[PDB]
Design a protein around this ligand. Structure first.
Ligand SMILES: Nc1nc2c(ncn2[C@H]2C[C@H](O)[C@@H](COP(=O)(O)OP(=O)(O)OP(=O)(O)O)O2)c(=O)[nH]1
Lengths: 118, 368, 341
């Protein structure tokens, strides 16, 4: 077993597969509640399922690390947890809807303060 | 505080639990056995609140189920009327009508106009308060976490609520209000408090789904009464707990997803709170030394009688709280002559106990 | 041994300190033991849990410390001008030593600290001050032999000791006044003889020990609490309360046995007038004890409603009412005591 995570605070965590699996399940359900025509949904399943499908083939934690890339398991679980909070907040945010506000004319125009031909 | 699901299995007690149910705790015993040795992560109290008919009993059951604490069922007013052989002293009819005949939550809901209702109004606080000490007993002995559905700390909400309705007396409001201080000072506030928040209409929807012939058809259920819970919870009850215990408020149980509640609680850690001791939050749990742990432990495993005896408060200035002497005398005659009350529990050989003529044992805080 | 383990330690050091005094050979050694008592007792008295305990601590310390200061000082003078511990005769050298000791044990003119104490003290802490913190100064008073000062103390040891007791409604202050009266009897008894004084204190220790030890049990702190304290039958409410009359030592209560012993030997000394006064005041002592026993002699009073059951410790209750039963039927043991001859 690796002695240290190389980072302060980030401690070595056992049963990573169980934790990663459990995290992937919850986020999948969290996106399950989403509407079926949300781009955020469309991609999270394929990404998460790709991860949650890679979780199994590599019993060795180091083997899984290489297979999944993207960093070490210790951070990787945190990545998953972050996204759990994202989905719960995302459902609460309803960002799949259309534009709340149209920018006023000449808002995002650079350079500023130049007369124009109508 | 941490869920079994993230443990990938069950939690273990760090050391052999102490048989506090069946054994007495001595200061000699404190010297002979250390206290915080058993203590672990989950050694904390998660109190629940919500407007009435919030169905939180199933919530707390599952929450303690999948975080590995004790459920500690809710108020059981009947236990006054229950004995070693079960039967209800409510069975005893109005032989002594005026202030000896019973009054359960049914009677309250049927009619809160009866001055005798004030009886349980305070005895109900005692039941909560006695339960709370039971929870502290279980914590300090086993080190295992606990979850009480409701607390004596919160009981005054209903108290001021009923009084605002007018049901209690101006006298009784003073009695209970001052008397809380006497005992309520002697309890540790919970680590974490979870309050559930439906509107008055919404709870009326669910209480009509409870279909209780002594509640749903009753008349107490005015918006004002069931709303006074809301205001009192919102500001009066919450704030002091908001000072000591960490406060989480989701919308309610029904939409309250257990797993996210599990995760939100687990995310809220307290090692973060292991900073300056003088901080007022978590204050009632900063035990410097193993000796001070044992002081708290012995104080609950060996002074529950002392805890009960705080209630001995003399107030003969309230008529509904006074009892008629001769009637009360008969009320004594009924109870201790009625089946299964002549002796201490286990010595009511008239009702069946055997092994007497040699048995001389008595249980820790065994009632009497 | 109330809450912590340190209670055992300080009690032990206290015992050693006081035991030094009673076994002390010279005034200095006795002073040494007294201060050790001063140390060992302050922490027990000054619980850190509440407030009232702490204020009692300054008053106890700020009084005892001066008492020890004066005691040693007057010792040096006596044991200078006489160049010997046992002076040939009692002069002005010696009255100061009693005045030290009388304050230390809380005797008649020097008592005001003692009621103010009781507010702070809890029960067994009070108890422990009541019984044991009065041995050493009294046993020293034995060595001092000034008749008239003890006599003025005995005269005034009951007057205030009972008149105040009439007035108090806090059980803490009543025990103070009750003992100051009883302390009147010890002081007279020690002026007469010591073996009888030893006996009388012991029975007083026993009686006060059982008394406050139940008040600790049920935590009854105010006359209202006594009237309100639930008992299942309101008969043991009355059987247990006989001891309040054993305070007055009325024959069928075993408090008579010591009072009889002191009276017998005292009148044998022929100080009849003194007996009359103390014994007149004894009635006032017993008077407010009946004022206490209105709670139990009659039965079936008006009570609070919420209480349904009453509970207490096994150990304390098991010990307590064995001591009570003796307070009930103690006399017939007339034979068992052979220390009076
Ligand atoms: N007078 C008075 N009644 C109370 C108090 N607390 C609760 N109750 C009464 C009101 C309720 O009709 C009844 C309990 O019903 P609940 O709403 O708590 O049922 P719930 O669905 O919450 O599940 P549970 O009670 O935990 O089994 O007891 C109180 O503090 N004072």
């Amino acid at each position: 077993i690796k002695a240290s995570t190389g980072l302060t605070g980030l401690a070595v965590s056992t049963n990573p597969h169980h934790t990663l699996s459990a995290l992937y399940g919850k986020i999948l359900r969290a996106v399950s509640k989403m509407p079926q025509d949300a781009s955020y949904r469309k991609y999270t399943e394929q990404l998460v399922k790709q991860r949650a499908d890679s979780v199994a083939q590599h019993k060795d934690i180091t083997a899984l690390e290489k297979a999944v890339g993207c960093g070490q398991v210790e951070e990787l679980i945190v990545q998953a947890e972050n996204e759990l909070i994202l989905a719960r907040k995302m459902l609460g945010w309803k960002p799949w809807e259309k534009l709340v506000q149209a920018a006023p004319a000449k808002q995002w125009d650079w350079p500023p303060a130049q007369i124009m031909e109508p | 505080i941490s869920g079994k699901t993230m443990r990938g299995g069950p939690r273990v007690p760090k050391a052999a639990p102490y048989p506090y149910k069946t054994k007495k705790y001595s200061v000699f015993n404190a010297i002979f056995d250390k206290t915080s040795k058993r203590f672990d992560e989950n050694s904390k109290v998660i109190c629940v609140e919500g407007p009435i008919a919030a169905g939180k009993s199933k919530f707390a059951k599952e929450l303690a189920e999948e975080l590995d604490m004790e459920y500690y069922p809710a108020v059981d007013l009947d236990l006054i009327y229950i004995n070693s052989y079960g039967y209800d002293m409510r069975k005893l009819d109005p032989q002594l009508p005026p202030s000896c005949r019973s009054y359960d939550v049914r009677n309250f809901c049927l009619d809160p106009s009866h001055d005798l209702a004030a009886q349980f109004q305070i005895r109900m606080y005692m039941l909560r308060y006695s339960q709370y000490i039971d929870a502290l007993q279980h914590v300090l002995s086993t080190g295992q976490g606990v979850v009480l559905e409701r607390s004596p700390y919160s009981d005054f909400v209903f108290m001021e609520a009923m009084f605002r309705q007018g049901y209690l007396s101006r006298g009784a409001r003073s009695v209970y209000n001052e008397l809380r201080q006497n005992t309520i000072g002697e309890l540790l506030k919970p680590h974490l408090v979870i309050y559930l928040d439906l509107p008055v209409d919404a709870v009326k929807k669910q209480i009509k789904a409870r279909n209780v012939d002594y509640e749903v058809q009753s008349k107490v259920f005015s918006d004002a009464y069931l709303s006074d819970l809301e205001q009192l919870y919102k500001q009066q009850y919450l704030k002091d707990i908001s000072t000591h215990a960490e406060l989480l408020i989701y919308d309610w149980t029904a939409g309250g997803e257990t797993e996210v509640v599990v995760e939100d609680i687990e995310r809220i850690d307290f090692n973060q709170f292991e900073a300056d001791i003088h901080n007022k939050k978590m204050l009632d749990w900063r035990f410097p030394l193993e000796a001070e742990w044992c002081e708290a432990r012995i104080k609950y495993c060996h002074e529950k009688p002392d805890l009960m005896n705080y209630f001995n408060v003399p107030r003969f200035d309230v008529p509904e709280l006074v009892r008629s002497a001769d009637d009360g005398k008969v009320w004594r005659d009924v109870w201790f002559n009625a089946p299964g009350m002549k002796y201490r529990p286990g010595y009511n050989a008239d009702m069946g106990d055997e092994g007497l003529l040699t048995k001389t044992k008595i249980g820790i805080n065994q009632g009497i | 041994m109330f809450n912590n383990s340190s209670k055992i330690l300080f009690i032990t050091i206290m015992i050693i300190g006081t035991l030094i005094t009673v076994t002390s050979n010279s005034w200095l050694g006795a002073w040494m033991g007294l201060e050790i008592n001063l140390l060992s007792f302050i922490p027990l008295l000054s619980d850190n849990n509440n407030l009232m305990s702490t204020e009692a601590s300054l008053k106890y310390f700020l009084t005892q410390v001066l008492a020890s200061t004066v005691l040693l000082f007057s010792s040096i003078l006596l044991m200078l001008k006489n160049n010997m511990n046992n002076e040939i005769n009692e002069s002005f050298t010696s009255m100061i030593i009693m005045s030290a000791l009388l304050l230390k044990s809380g005797a008649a003119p020097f008592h005001f600290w003692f009621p103010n104490m009781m507010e702070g003290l809890t029960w067994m802490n009070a108890l422990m001050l009541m019984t044991w913190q009065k041995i050493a100064p009294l046993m020293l008073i034995s060595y001092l032999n000034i008749k008239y000062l003890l006599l003025i103390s005995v005269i005034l040891s009951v007057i205030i000791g009972a008149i105040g007791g009439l007035n108090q409604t806090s059980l803490r202050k009543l025990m103070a006044f009750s003992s100051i009266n009883h302390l009147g009897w010890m002081l007279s008894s020690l002026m007469i003889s010591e073996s009888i004084w030893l006996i009388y204190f012991f029975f007083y220790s026993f009686l006060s020990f059982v008394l406050t030890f139940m008040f600790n049990i049920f935590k009854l702190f105010h006359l209202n609490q006594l009237f309100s304290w639930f008992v299942n039958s309101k008969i043991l409410k009355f059987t247990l309360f006989m001891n309040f009359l054993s305070l007055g030592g009325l024959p069928p209560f075993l408090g008579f046995l010591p009072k009889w012993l002191v009276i017998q030997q005292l009148t044998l000394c022929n100080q009849y007038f003194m007996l009359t006064l103390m014994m007149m005041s004894t009635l006032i002592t017993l008077f407010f004890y009946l004022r206490i026993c209105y709670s139990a002699f009659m039965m079936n009073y008006f009570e609070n409603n919420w209480i349904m059951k009453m509970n207490m410790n096994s150990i304390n209750y098991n010990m307590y009412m064995i001591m009570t039963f003796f307070s009930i039927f103690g006399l017939f043991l007339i034979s068992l005591f052979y220390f009076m001859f």
